[PDB]
């Protein structure tokens, strides 16, 4: 529908305007974190982020054109990849740290507070390092996030989704053309960016196994997180 019509510059504006807000952690606990308390904060935060993500997806040109069945499928497939690329983007300006929220900025060693989390932290930090090395721009980031949403479940059911993916590719190349990158540099950078999505898929699968491992059952997960987690079993 609407989405294929758009200008590259328009597509970027539609996607910048759709960006969900940055949410805050609960202030209490406001201490050195325990396993149970750290798990509590992250569960609460992820659950509120998920509600904003669902509403962001509806503002992604082309997504509302899909049937409810297909929107559900894409979101069940992509939700943790989307949380993770958001986390990685927010964490750009804090090398060696993860900005879960402005009042929840965690170092590698705080990763150890939960068992099996430091492995995923390290992968997330590595992705933040890579985005910085590439000088990832906000306009590219919003393109990558929409590609994850439309791409991650497309194989697991298509023509329309592939046409919108082609449009977001056009938009990324458009953006790199305007920064004055040569044709060679544009296709090189387009490749480097899309190869990161393979690493983000890997981190999502590791994080998903981590979330299944809880139930442990220290902290109950929200009804929404459990719904999304159970779409991956």
């Amino acid at each position: 529908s609407l989405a294929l019509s758009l200008t590259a510059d328009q597509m970027v504006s539609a996607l910048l305007d759709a960006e969900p807000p940055i949410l805050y952690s609960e202030y209490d606990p406001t201490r050195p974190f325990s396993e149970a308390s750290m798990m509590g904060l992250l569960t609460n935060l992820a659950d509120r982020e998920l509600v904003h993500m669902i509403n962001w997806a509806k503002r992604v040109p082309g997504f509302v054109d899909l049937t409810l069945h297909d929107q559900v499928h894409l979101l069940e497939c992509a939700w943790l990849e989307i949380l993770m690329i958001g986390l990685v983007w927010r964490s750009m300006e804090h090398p060696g740290k993860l900005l879960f929220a402005p009042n929840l900025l965690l170092d590698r060693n705080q990763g150890k507070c939960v068992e099996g989390m430091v492995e995923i932290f390290d992968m997330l930090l590595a992705t933040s390092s890579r985005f910085r090395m590439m000088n990832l721009q906000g306009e590219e980031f919003v393109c990558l996030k929409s590609i994850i949403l439309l791409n991650s479940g497309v194989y697991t059911f298509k023509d329309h989704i592939h046409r919108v993916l082609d449009k977001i590719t056009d938009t990324l190349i458009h953006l790199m053309a305007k920064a004055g990158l040569t044709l060679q540099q544009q296709h090189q950078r387009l490749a480097q960016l899309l190869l990161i999505l393979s690493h983000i898929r890997h981190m999502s699968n590791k994080g998903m196994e981590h979330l299944y491992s809880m139930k442990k059952n220290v902290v109950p997960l929200s009804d929404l997180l459990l719904e999304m987690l159970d779409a991956h079993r």
């Binding site: 069940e76 719904e227 999304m228």
Partner: peptide
């Protein structure tokens, strides 16, 4: 599904 609700809401 809560996901169905929020996608319609």
């Amino acid at each position: 599904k809560i996901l169905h609700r929020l996608l319609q809401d």
